[PDB]
Copies of this chain bind each other. A is one copy, B any other.
Amino acid sequence: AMISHIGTIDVFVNDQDKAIDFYVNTLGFELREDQAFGPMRWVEVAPAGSQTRIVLCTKHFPVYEEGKIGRFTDIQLVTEDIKATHEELVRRGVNFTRAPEQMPANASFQDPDGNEFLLLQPS
Contact = CB atoms under 8 A, between A and B. Distances in A.
A48 B5 CA distance: 7
A8 B51 CA distance: 12
A6 to B, nearest CB: 5
This chain: how many copies in the complex?
2
Interface residues of A, number: 39
A78 B4 contact: yes
A33 B6 CA distance: 17
A17 interface: no
B50 A80 contact: no
Given A51-B52, A52-B51, A3 B78 contact: yes
A45 to B, nearest CB: 11
Interface string A60-82: 00010000000010111111110
